[PDB]
């Protein structure tokens, strides 16, 4: 059983360029930042985000 | 006996005269013709990989 | 020799012809449900607004 964890929607996570899962996030100053995830397992229509 | 990993591919491959190619289309500038617009293409073509 | 070069060149000018094309391109990796919910939105928002 996993504790307090992050379930990202599948519309916001995507792969790129012989690499891994990434997502675009809004910064504190309303800028777009690229973040690297280790999303592996699917819960319904969500990715269980483990690190990132 | 089987694992998986995510790669990055293309969903529409295309070929021209039996060799791999990609297809680019557009319009001339508003008010400009197609002759000088097509003359405004091949000077970019030398700025490609060999 | 001046107004000749002042006139731009065209080819088959456009008329009404009663038809129009709408092209929808969802982001890559999306399912047909995500595309369908945009397509029926864009017909229902321009079937009575137009």
């Amino acid at each position: 059983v996993k504790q307090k964890a992050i379930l990202a929607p599948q519309q916001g996570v995507t792969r790129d360029l012989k690499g891994q899962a990434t997502a675009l996030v809004v910064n504190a100053q309303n800028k777009v930042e690229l973040r690297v995830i280790k999303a592996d397992r699917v819960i319904g229509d969500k990715w269980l985000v483990t690190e990132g | 006996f089987a694992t998986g990993k995510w790669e990055y591919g293309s969903p529409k491959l295309e070929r021209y005269n039996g060799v791999p190619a990609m297809e680019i289309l557009g319009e001339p500038a508003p008010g400009l013709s197609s002759g000088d617009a097509m003359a405004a293409v091949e000077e970019i073509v030398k700025q490609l990989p060999k | 020799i001046w107004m000749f070069t002042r006139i731009p060149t065209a080819f088959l000018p456009d008329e009404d012809q009663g038809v129009l094309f709408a092209q929808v391109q969802t982001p890559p990796g999306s399912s047909a449900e995500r595309t369908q919910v945009v397509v029926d939105s864009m017909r229902e928002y321009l079937l009575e607004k137009e």
Side-chain angles (χ1 to χ4, degrees), chain B residues 3-45:
Chain B
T3 69
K5 49 172 183 288
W6 292 80
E7 296 170 357
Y8 205 48
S10 187
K12 176 194 172 71
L13 291 164
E14 58 182 1
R15 299 172 75 87
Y16 186 92
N17 281 146
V19 81
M22 304 198 172
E23 180 208 14
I24 297 106
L25 55 89
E27 293 94 3
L32 274 72
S33 67
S34 277
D36 40 17
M38 278 172 40
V41 164
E42 86 287 331
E43 87 280 351
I44 318 170
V45 165

Side-chain angles (χ1 to χ4, degrees), chain C residues 12-21:
Chain C
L12 316 180
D14 44 321
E15 41 256 46
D16 190 82
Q17 292 189 337
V19 302
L20 192 84
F21 297 149

